[PDB]
Design a protein around this ligand. Structure first.
Ligand SMILES: *C/C=C(C)/C=C/C=C(C)/C=C/C1=C(C)CCCC1(C)C
Length: 232
């Protein structure tokens, strides 16, 4: 019965793998030249996030990143490999924006640590047997998310507006893309296999695939095609 997996969403997973991989190879066979030590950081950071995502999407495709969790009434398919990805992916995405706005080490740590809680709490939620409690973890995860998005929006903007026109402009486009994409994750989770079965794992997988590739490669293509602070 149970929210069928290991087979339907294979195309989505495979397609995720393809885009992440090509996006990786792209950022690689583009960062060939790049002298500027500042620009060097952005290329490095932004190339690892596709590579992490490639590794993890492969595991889901090949089955390894799938597991079964007892909840609600049945044997529920869960892709923990998402949290393995996101654990390192989402802090690096933050580090790009931190570096771009030259944020204080204080905020950076507060940020990365908070992101740590967001994903960790998410995984605890995803694997929690007791149905009712999954939403306790979702709420906490969403609090960690909205905190991060707050400092990005109401914080990092002001600091950005004081940099260079290019930096303020570039940060803002990214800030927009980030706030929007990130805010989708708790929604698609809550309606998906992982929470209330409004929407099947099949669509849950597809939504996350589109969101993920946008938040890795789409995000990266805004950044690595602009003036990356002093550098290019
Ligand atoms: C490339 C992947 C990205 C940018 C992933 C972002 C992930 C989040 C913003 C996750 C948020 C979550 C919630 C707020 C609730 C349920 C648990 C999470 C981790 C899925």
């Amino acid at each position: 019965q149970a929210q069928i997996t290991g087979r339907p969403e294979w195309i989505w997973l495979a397609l995720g793998t393809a885009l992440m991989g090509l996006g990786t190879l792209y950022f690689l066979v583009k960062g060939m030249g790049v002298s500027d030590p500042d620009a060097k950081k952005f290329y490095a950071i932004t190339t690892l996030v596709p590579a992490i995502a490639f590794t993890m999407y492969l595991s889901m495709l090949l089955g390894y990143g799938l597991t079964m969790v007892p909840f609600g009434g049945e044997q529920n398919p869960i892709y923990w490999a998402r949290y393995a990805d996101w654990l390192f992916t989402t802090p690096l995405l933050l580090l790009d924006l931190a570096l771009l706005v030259d944020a204080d080490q204080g905020t950076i740590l507060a940020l990365v640590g908070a992101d740590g809680i967001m994903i960790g709490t998410g995984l605890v939620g995803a694997l929690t047997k007791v149905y009712s409690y999954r939403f306790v973890w979702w709420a906490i995860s969403t609090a960690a998310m909205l905190y991060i998005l707050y400092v990005l929006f109401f914080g990092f903007t002001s600091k950005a507006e004081s940099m260079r026109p290019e930096v303020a402009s570039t940060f803002k486009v990214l800030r927009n893309v980030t706030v929007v994409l990130w805010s989708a994750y708790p929604v698609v989770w809550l309606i998906g296999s992982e929470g209330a079965g409004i929407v099947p794992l099949n669509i849950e997988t597809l939504l996350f695939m589109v969101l993920d590739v946008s938040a890795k490669v789409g995000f990266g293509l805004i950044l690595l095609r602009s003036r990356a602070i002093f550098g290019e």
